[PDB]
Amino acid sequence: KDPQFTNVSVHDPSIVKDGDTYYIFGSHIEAAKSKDLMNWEKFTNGYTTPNNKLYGDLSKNLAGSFKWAGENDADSKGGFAVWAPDVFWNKDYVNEDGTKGAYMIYYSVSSTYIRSAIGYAVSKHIEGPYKYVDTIVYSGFTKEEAYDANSKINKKWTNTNIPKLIEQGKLKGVRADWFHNDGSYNNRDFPNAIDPNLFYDEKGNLWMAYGSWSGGIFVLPMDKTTGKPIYPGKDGKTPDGRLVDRYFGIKIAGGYYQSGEGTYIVYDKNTDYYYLYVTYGWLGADGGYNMRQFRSTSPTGPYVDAKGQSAVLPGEVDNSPYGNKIMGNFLFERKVGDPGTGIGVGYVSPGHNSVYLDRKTGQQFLVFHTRFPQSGEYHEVRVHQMFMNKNGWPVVAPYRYAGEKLEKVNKQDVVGEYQLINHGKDYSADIKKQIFVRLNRNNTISGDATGTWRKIGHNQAEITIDGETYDGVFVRQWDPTSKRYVMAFTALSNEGVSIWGSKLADKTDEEIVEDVASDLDLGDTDHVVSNLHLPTEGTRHTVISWTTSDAKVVSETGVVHRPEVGSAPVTATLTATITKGDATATKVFHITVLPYEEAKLTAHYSFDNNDLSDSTGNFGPGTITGNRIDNEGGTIAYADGKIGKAAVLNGQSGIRLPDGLVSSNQYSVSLWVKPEQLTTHTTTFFGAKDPNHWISLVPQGWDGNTMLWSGSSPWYDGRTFWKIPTGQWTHLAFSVDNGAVKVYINGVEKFSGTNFPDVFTGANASFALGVNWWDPPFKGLIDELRIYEGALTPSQVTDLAQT
Ligand SMILES: OC[C@@H]1O[C@@H](OC[C@@H]2O[C@@H](OC[C@@H]3O[C@@H](OC[C@@H]4O[C@@H](OC[C@@H]5O[C@@H](O)[C@H](O)[C@H]5O)[C@H](O)[C@H]4O)[C@H](O)[C@H]3O)[C@H](O)[C@H]2O)[C@H](O)[C@H]1O
Ligand SMILES: [Ca+2]
Ligand SMILES: [Ca+2]
């Protein structure tokens, strides 16, 4: 572990270098710095105001733009939306004391998917504070007086700077295309005006590129002295038919509501290309955020990919095949017996890049955020080096930067066995994973694919696979999993498809097989109650073959059979037999499967005596709420029930149950509902230590089906995929045994899942019926609310669905 990292969360980072310091400015007024692109240190205070670091009094300072969006309005209601900034030292800028030189920050304020604007502020010193100057591109404005939900900002186009731009003849007047017919904004062809990128060209002229989804990316020339756009003035098309707009500029990528934002464009002189980066898809874990690359010889476009396809989309089409997919979801998955520990290094939804191009050395760096597998929306910044391949395309390193650099590489150090990921073009929540190949000394590639390779010169890599020639480089990289510097390669085909390779360490088949044994564990095989996951592959296509000493206890796949209540617990032996080549090893596990034990009835509110009593004796009676759990003022009638009399919930009332009704992680609930109507989220059985710690049995959940639901730290979706009938009785129940949760309907298991929260032990919880904190009370009758200490047996539940 020579190298050493120090992480931060900065979302949509724009890299910039002051003196010998690196700096990244992100959305939500986050910023951090580094000497090494490795250890980062945050120096902002987020949205704190005043004494906000970057702005001081955020609200007065930037009031120019909050008038239009980003402060306490529509989607920004209750806070601020200051997004996706870009910073750069502008030496030619004239400050307001008439001196020259200033760090400029362009930012986005947005209050809906379309009503946004770009503004900018200046400081003389990179760390701040920056001071408002002007708000300069707007989107989402209407033809006539219009307002958004939770806003009283006249959206009409006369609230924008456009009036004044026309006043100055910077425009001849309003374009009718900006509006649809109802007069709403034409975000099919015109941009959401966020995600600014400022760049210089071949001659050090300055441009702003911007846009996100909606009509796509435009670019505008900028006045180097005042930082204002030199607006086109006229509509038209460019020679290749791309849109030019008097105000928005020249469309250079995207279109027709399709994804694509986070634009960053870089002039490279060593090749004379304008490299355009843009990030496709949605930013969240399930959105498949992925970075794309094109290039143009002119800053103004046309920008095209490795296949010469336009960045600008022809219609409202899948954008998948456009641009070079240089990075998306991937995972060098640890299989059993791989060194290191845990799942392996991979990213999820990596995107919104910026790039730094060290002027003296040609060295290049991709800087971006990514989420990670099994981390949810948690995000850190990452930095991957990039190297100009032989076709004028920078190719992106597989691992984050760790001091490495381009090198004279010897052939022996390449030859070997690799992990190989292929990024493709497609993008979704799906994660791309490795195959195993080897690069043989006779310049062939064998294993999970077949083909050829060469190393030209010191480092240039040629790889050719079922006709596809990928061009890039070879280079050493830090592998956190093995904790070593490993040889590696990254390379682009003429489809604009990247493949990445990491070298595995030489290892005899004997060696591998013993490694796999050593890593093969099954956890607790002494108190076994549910099926065991028997892995069938180890590292490097190692076959793990499983036999059983008794398939009545457990199958070769790990299907267990719990003996009956009151039966002895049963034993058996599983034999892993691990094989690579002719090498083999053998690890055994002795298993014990436990019989069912009967869960034990602890409270029963039958309502059978026109009262709220617990016929077990164990608990005090229920008492009556209003429409919420912590209020009062309701009525409970007692109508005829599924079994004797039932409670009546009239939509206004609910029932409060003793705190600590449940107090374990080994418990169960049964009850019978006949619902008169169905309101989303409205609970039946509600249990809660507090409003971020609760469990709720819901007839029509967020998916519109019945479901057992738990939130907010963490959420957990017990989805039945089954819809309750009104005006009819339906028996419900659920088990919880230390982590394990099942849910039954009308006797039948509809959900089984795992890792369910322990919400009723380490304090004391409130409990209720039909009411909660937030949603309509329950309408109708609830019957035979039985509560148990133990996880109910499947047979016990079919007894319950019976009468
Ligand atoms: O009394 C004043 C209130 O108390 C405080 O409550 C804290 C918040 O409320 C709790 O949630 C209650 C719950 O949320 C409402 O619906 C909104 C849902 O949020 C989304 O959650 C994500 C989903 O979870 C998974 O199933 C799946 O991954 C996602 O689809 C969900 O999609 C929305 O439907 C509803 O009204 C109510 O039942 C939380 O614990 C906490 O955040 C507040 O200060 C105040 O309001
Ligand atoms: Ca950006
Ligand atoms: Ca009853």
Domains of the chain plus CATH, in order, are 1-403 (2.115.10.20), 404-504 (2.40.128.10), 505-598 (no CATH), 599-803 (no CATH)
Q: Which residue, 780, 779, 769, is CA-closest to 679?
A: 779
Burial class (CB within 10 angstroms; exposed 0-12, middle 13-18, buried 19+) of 437: buried
Question: Which atom of ligand 1 approaches the CA of 773 most closely?
Answer: 1
Within 10 angstroms of residue 264's Cβ, the number of other Cβ atoms is: 26
User: Tokens in use for 171?
Assistant: 């425009």
DSSP state of 382: E
Q: 640, 783 in Cβ contact below 8 A?
A: no
DSSP state of 160: S
Protein residue whose Cα sits closest to atom 12 of ligand 1 = 774
304: which strand partners?
A: 295, 310
Does 12 qualify as catalytic in the annotation?
A: yes
Question: Entry resolution in angstroms?
Answer: 3.0
Q: Which residue, 61, 77, 80, 130, is CA-closest to 102?
A: 130
Question: Which atom of ligand 1 approaches the CA of 717 most closely?
Answer: 26
Ligand 1 neighbourhood includes 284 CB (under 6 angstroms)? no
Q: Which residue, 548, 560, 412, 538, is CA-closest to 474?
A: 412
Per-residue CA distances from 423 to 289, 430, 448, 479, 500 (Å): 13, 11, 16, 19, 8
- What gap in Å lies between CA 293 and CA 489, rounded to an integer? 19
- Beta 330-331 vs 432-433: how paired, if at all? parallel
Q: Which residue, 549, 526, 750, 783, is CA-closest to 644?
A: 783
Q: Which of 148, 245, 261, 515 is catalytic?
A: 261
- Beta 570-580 vs 542-548: how paired, if at all? antiparallel
3-state secondary structure 605-649: ECCCCCCCCCCCCCCCCCEEECCCCCCCCCCEEEEECCCCEEEEE
Q: Where are the beta strands (DSSP E) in 228-323?
A: 236-237, 243-245, 249-253, 261-268, 273-280, 290-296
- What gap in Å lies between CA 77 and CA 685, rounded to an integer? 33
- What gap in Å lies between CA 369 and CA 749, rounded to an integer? 41
- Beta 346-357 vs 330-331: how paired, if at all? antiparallel
Q: 561, 541 in Cβ contact below 8 A?
A: no
Q: 634, 624 in Cβ contact below 8 A?
A: yes
- What gap in Å lies between CA 27 and CA 72, rounded to an integer? 17
- What gap in Å lies between CA 214 and CA 192, rounded to an integer? 6
Q: Which residue, 70, 1, 66, 67, is CA-closest to 38?
A: 1
Q: 333, 343 in Cβ contact below 8 A?
A: yes
Protein residue whose Cα sits closest to atom 30 of ligand 1 = 702
**3 state SS of 334:** coil
Q: 485, 546 in Cβ contact below 8 A?
A: no
Q: 785, 658 in Cβ contact below 8 A?
A: no
Within 10 angstroms of residue 336's Cβ, the number of other Cβ atoms is: 20
- What gap in Å lies between CA 562 and CA 531, rounded to an integer? 10
At CB < 8 A and 24+ separation, what contacts does 650-653 make?
650/779, 651/677, 651/776, 651/777, 651/778, 651/779, 652/626, 652/627, 652/777, 653/624, 653/625, 653/626, 653/627, 653/770, 653/771, 653/777
Experimental technique, in short, is X-ray
Q: 249, 243 in Cβ contact below 8 A?
A: no
Ligand 3 center to 661 CA (angstroms): 19
Residue type, 392: G
Which residues have a Cβ under 8 Å from the Cβ of 176 and sit 6 or more positions away?
A: none
Q: Which residue, 289, 285, 207, is CA-closest to 250?
A: 207
**3 state SS of 778:** coil
- Beta 707-712 vs 488-492: how paired, if at all? unpaired
Does 261 qualify as catalytic in the annotation?
A: yes
Give the angle subtended at the CA of 327 by the CAs of 325 and 329, to the nearest 5°: 115
- What gap in Å lies between CA 184 and CA 6, rounded to an integer? 46
- What gap in Å lies between CA 679 and CA 779, rounded to an integer? 9
Which residues have a Cβ under 8 Å from the Cβ of 77 and sit 6 or more positions away?
A: 150
Q: 560, 592 in Cβ contact below 8 A?
A: no
